[PDB]
């Protein structure tokens, strides 16, 4: 009946990737096991960010499979709603950080430069 739009589309991708086969149960879990260890939202957002960034990269690889484009882009928007709270700036800043190439010589020089002020505010505000 009434269920969040991702459920319908997520199980559609489940069939396309054969994620319903009994062989997926092998070799533990990627995200579900870790996420149960961290109940504090600060810890969760640290882990969820890496998980959300993972799905966006995965969907980017299958942007050419037009069979699943409907299911993919619906889940992407629901992630934009649940995780980024529909904040377009939050979504756009997130995408910039991901796309930085760690082999771009200019990027690492700027990264090494900004390191001090990044470490300066890694700890929570007083």
């Amino acid at each position: 009946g009434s269920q969040d739009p991702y459920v319908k589309e997520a199980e559609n991708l489940k069939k396309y990737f054969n994620a319903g086969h009994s062989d997926v149960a092998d070799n533990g879990t990627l995200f579900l096991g870790i996420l149960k260890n961290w109940k504090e939202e600060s810890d969760r957002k640290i882990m969820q960010s890496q998980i959300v960034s993972f799905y966006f990269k995965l969907f980017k690889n299958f942007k050419d499979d037009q069979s699943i484009q409907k299911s993919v882009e619906t889940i992407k928007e629901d992630m934009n709603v649940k995780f980024f709270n529909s904040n377009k700036k939050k979504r756009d800043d997130f995408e910039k950080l991901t796309n930085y190439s760690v082999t771009d010589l200019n990027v690492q020089r700027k990264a090494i430069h900004e390191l001090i002020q990044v470490m300066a505010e890694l700890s929570p505000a007083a």
Binding site: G1, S2, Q3, D4, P5, Q69, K70, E73, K76, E77, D78, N80, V81, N85, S86, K88, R91
Partner: protein, 213 residues
Amino acid sequence: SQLPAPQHPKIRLYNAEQVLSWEPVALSNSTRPVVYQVQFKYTDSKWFTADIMSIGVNCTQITATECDFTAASPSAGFPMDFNVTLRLRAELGALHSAWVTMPWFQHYRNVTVGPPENIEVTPGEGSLIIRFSSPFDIADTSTAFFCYYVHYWEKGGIQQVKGPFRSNSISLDNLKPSRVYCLQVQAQLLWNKSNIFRVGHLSNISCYETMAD
């Protein structure tokens, strides 16, 4: 080649309805009826054809000058949280017109909320009990809910507003017994993300007399 684009499109966001309408496109030399194609896209996404698989209704190469996304079934249509952008064009075979792109909308943010439905009032001793239906059924109450206001006043008196209250039933306590009171019910859609509220339309006036004892 090139055709004239559809004229003056409108997005009707009333209650749970989602209807896109436009003025038809005609030619002087018209051989067959012109069809239209509607497409939707999310904030940073690809354009999709509005077809039975994508949205559950057939809105491409259709003869009608409107398309109702919410007609098929409950919860069908675009999710009320999503940021949806629509565009439209008229085409006659190989010929097609320019894309008429609508402004972006989020359902909770742009909806025109109607009055509460099926209002029933029963008198009590110096009070009036009001039971009513919600303006529309929301899937997730945690993300959005309704706040109701009752505008009550004695006949020929100054306005008084009781509210807001979450429940669909309220008691108008502390009223003058055996006196006529008139009331109006008005809802308010609250979306926690928006931190701005949508003021719903008021219902018709209806006056009732309280009991004696």
